[PDB]
Scaffold this active site. Sequence first.
Site, PDB file in Angstrom:
ATOM      1  N   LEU A  43       0.869  -1.353   0.057  1.00  0.00           N
ATOM      2  CA  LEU A  43      -0.006   0.053   0.206  1.00  0.00           C
ATOM      3  C   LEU A  43       0.818   1.208   0.200  1.00  0.00           C
ATOM      4  CD1 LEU A  43      -2.874  -1.038   2.575  1.00  0.00           C
ATOM      5  CD2 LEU A  43      -3.035  -1.051   0.139  1.00  0.00           C
ATOM      6  N   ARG A  45       5.086   2.828   1.306  1.00  0.00           N
ATOM      7  CA  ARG A  45       6.388   2.901   2.031  1.00  0.00           C
ATOM      8  C   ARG A  45       6.698   4.159   2.843  1.00  0.00           C
ATOM      9  N   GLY A  46       7.547   4.157   3.497  1.00  0.00           N
ATOM     10  CA  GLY A  46       7.870   5.437   4.322  1.00  0.00           C
ATOM     11  C   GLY A  46       9.686   4.881   4.586  1.00  0.00           C
ATOM     12  N   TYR A  48      10.843   4.569   7.424  1.00  0.00           N
ATOM     13  CA  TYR A  48      11.041   3.706   8.483  1.00  0.00           C
ATOM     14  C   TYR A  48       9.923   2.237   8.506  1.00  0.00           C
ATOM     15  CZ  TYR A  48      14.430   6.745  10.460  1.00  0.00           C
ATOM     16  OH  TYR A  48      15.443   7.721  10.582  1.00  0.00           O
ATOM     17  N   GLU A  50       7.336  -0.183   5.753  1.00  0.00           N
ATOM     18  CA  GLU A  50       6.561  -0.757   4.743  1.00  0.00           C
ATOM     19  C   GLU A  50       5.101  -1.110   5.057  1.00  0.00           C
ATOM     20  OE1 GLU A  50       9.229  -2.825   1.754  1.00  0.00           O
ATOM     21  OE2 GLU A  50       9.356  -0.685   1.134  1.00  0.00           O
ATOM     22  N   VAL A  51       4.106  -0.520   4.305  1.00  0.00           N
ATOM     23  CA  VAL A  51       2.879  -1.038   4.723  1.00  0.00           C
ATOM     24  C   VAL A  51       2.096  -1.905   3.612  1.00  0.00           C
ATOM     25  CG1 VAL A  51       0.722   0.047   5.377  1.00  0.00           C
ATOM     26  CG2 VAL A  51       2.855   1.273   5.579  1.00  0.00           C
ATOM     27  N   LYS A  66       2.128  -2.930   8.893  1.00  0.00           N
ATOM     28  CA  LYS A  66       3.340  -1.973   8.968  1.00  0.00           C
ATOM     29  C   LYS A  66       4.502  -2.793   9.329  1.00  0.00           C
ATOM     30  CE  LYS A  66       4.474   2.419  11.388  1.00  0.00           C
ATOM     31  NZ  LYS A  66       3.935   3.374  12.183  1.00  0.00           N
ATOM     32  N   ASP A 154       2.078  14.153  14.305  1.00  0.00           N
ATOM     33  CA  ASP A 154       2.262  14.092  12.748  1.00  0.00           C
ATOM     34  C   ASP A 154       0.800  13.855  12.353  1.00  0.00           C
ATOM     35  OD1 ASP A 154       3.531  13.699  10.328  1.00  0.00           O
ATOM     36  OD2 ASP A 154       3.912  11.718  10.519  1.00  0.00           O
TER      37      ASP A 154
HETATM   38  C1  LIG Z   1       0.123   1.437   9.188  1.00  0.00           C
HETATM   39  C2  LIG Z   1       0.569   2.397   8.406  1.00  0.00           C
HETATM   40  C3  LIG Z   1       0.797   3.658   8.760  1.00  0.00           C
HETATM   41  O1  LIG Z   1       0.676   4.212   9.999  1.00  0.00           O
HETATM   42  N1  LIG Z   1       0.662   4.603   7.762  1.00  0.00           N
HETATM   43  C4  LIG Z   1       0.528   4.409   6.541  1.00  0.00           C
HETATM   44  C5  LIG Z   1      -0.646   3.887   5.985  1.00  0.00           C
HETATM   45  C6  LIG Z   1      -1.176   3.671   4.690  1.00  0.00           C
HETATM   46  N2  LIG Z   1      -2.206   3.262   4.337  1.00  0.00           N
HETATM   47  C7  LIG Z   1      -3.321   2.691   4.910  1.00  0.00           C
HETATM   48  C8  LIG Z   1      -4.325   2.190   4.129  1.00  0.00           C
HETATM   49  C9  LIG Z   1      -5.556   1.918   4.813  1.00  0.00           C
HETATM   50  N3  LIG Z   1      -6.687   1.632   4.160  1.00  0.00           N
HETATM   51  C10 LIG Z   1      -6.652   1.688   2.774  1.00  0.00           C
HETATM   52  C11 LIG Z   1      -6.461   0.808   1.847  1.00  0.00           C
HETATM   53  C12 LIG Z   1      -7.992   0.972   2.067  1.00  0.00           C
HETATM   54  N4  LIG Z   1      -5.451   1.806   5.957  1.00  0.00           N
HETATM   55  N5  LIG Z   1      -6.510   1.321   6.968  1.00  0.00           N
HETATM   56  C13 LIG Z   1      -6.074   1.435   8.268  1.00  0.00           C
HETATM   57  C14 LIG Z   1      -4.630   1.758   7.894  1.00  0.00           C
HETATM   58  C15 LIG Z   1      -3.913   2.173   9.302  1.00  0.00           C
HETATM   59  N6  LIG Z   1      -3.249   2.478  10.055  1.00  0.00           N
HETATM   60  C16 LIG Z   1      -4.341   2.270   6.787  1.00  0.00           C
HETATM   61  N7  LIG Z   1      -3.426   2.592   6.172  1.00  0.00           N
HETATM   62  C17 LIG Z   1      -0.172   4.134   3.930  1.00  0.00           C
HETATM   63  F1  LIG Z   1      -0.403   3.854   2.379  1.00  0.00           F
HETATM   64  C18 LIG Z   1       1.209   4.449   3.880  1.00  0.00           C
HETATM   65  C19 LIG Z   1       1.576   4.846   5.429  1.00  0.00           C
HETATM   66  N8  LIG Z   1       2.629   5.491   5.785  1.00  0.00           N
HETATM   67  C20 LIG Z   1       3.323   6.521   4.895  1.00  0.00           C
HETATM   68  C21 LIG Z   1       3.947   7.577   5.966  1.00  0.00           C
HETATM   69  C22 LIG Z   1       5.031   6.758   6.733  1.00  0.00           C
HETATM   70  C23 LIG Z   1       4.326   5.521   7.519  1.00  0.00           C
HETATM   71  N9  LIG Z   1       5.107   4.919   8.588  1.00  0.00           N
HETATM   72  C24 LIG Z   1       6.146   5.902   9.408  1.00  0.00           C
HETATM   73  C25 LIG Z   1       3.469   4.757   6.445  1.00  0.00           C
END
Ligand code: A1IG6
Length: 331
Positions: A43, A45-46, A48, A50-51, A66, A154
């Site tokens: 879905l 990346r970041g 830190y 990968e999602v 995550k 954030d």
């Molecule tokens: C758990 C993932 C996190 O914390 N961030 C994150 C999430 C998504 N995508 C989605 C997408 C959906 N539903 C849609 C598919 C229908 N849902 N539903 C629930 C949750 C959660 N939590 C989520 N998250 C992403 F595309 C990039 C990042 N990132 C991008 C910025 C940095 C970050 N980590 C440091 C990761």
Amino acid sequence: GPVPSRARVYTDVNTHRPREYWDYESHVVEWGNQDDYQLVRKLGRGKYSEVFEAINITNNEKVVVKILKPVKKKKIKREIKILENLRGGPNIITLADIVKDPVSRTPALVFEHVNNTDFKQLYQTLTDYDIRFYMYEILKALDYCHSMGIMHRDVKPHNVMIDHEHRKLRLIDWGLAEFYHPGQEYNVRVASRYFKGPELLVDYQMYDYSLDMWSLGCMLASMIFRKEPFFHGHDNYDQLVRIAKVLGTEDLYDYIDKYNIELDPRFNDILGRHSRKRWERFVHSENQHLVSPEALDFLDKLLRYDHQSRLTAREAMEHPYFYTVVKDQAR
Ligand SMILES: CCC(=O)Nc1cc(Nc2cc(NC3CC3)n3ncc(C#N)c3n2)c(F)cc1N1CCC[C@H](NC)C1
């Protein structure tokens, strides 16, 4: 040195808790079974993580995984404790499980799935009411987490998942969230650039929940004015200049003076002198249907240099901008 600062609300909440509540380094992690989750598709990346979308094979539930890249174990423990502490709270994403990824020996957080509408397509169709509604929902989450002694740090569009179909909103990504302790000096290198409060940009470290409310202000501005992002700086310095060109330099300088902030000598040449602008100048035929006296009053009181003088989430929730939302929620 700089003048100290305490939060106006929820000041001592963590002090009155058991140590284990906030002393996260002590948290022992109970790992779930990694094979309960099969990855479907990536879905995002970041820096830190990968999602992934995954399916929980036990019950066939869709789930969001995550997989953490190598970070300080401290910070893993910290995100987990915060999520555990906030579980069940309004519009807060549920941490469903925690597994040890086999293809990285790394920790992977498993989250509830939100059927999220893309923030490009959504922030175009949003009516005035929808913005009020979803802003109210975000505030529920911010007030709750703040009342529980934690700051997200954030807040921004991409960390708000909205299932428009079910008018359901989840504040996600708690990986920069931290416990508020009176007197603590925090890292300013948090939040995303367009959403950084002045306190971060001028390196005032003794900040608090009010940081989140600045970020919320930035979001609101962009939604009602249809300008994503609203303060669009090229870096942390120019970011404060963009702000200064709207909020004026008069209040900025009063702000650095009040808290006796040592201002990077860089800034001295680029901030210049600027009047505080009236919000009308950001109003155009295209966006006017979203802008109202109420919206501007509310926005004004989020976007203030001095963190102590911004609305608290609970105060925000009481503003006239949400009156129709509140009446509709009680019916
Ligand atoms: C758990 C993932 C996190 O914390 N961030 C994150 C999430 C998504 N995508 C989605 C997408 C959906 N539903 C849609 C598919 C229908 N849902 N539903 C629930 C949750 C959660 N939590 C989520 N998250 C992403 F595309 C990039 C990042 N990132 C991008 C910025 C940095 C970050 N980590 C440091 C990761």
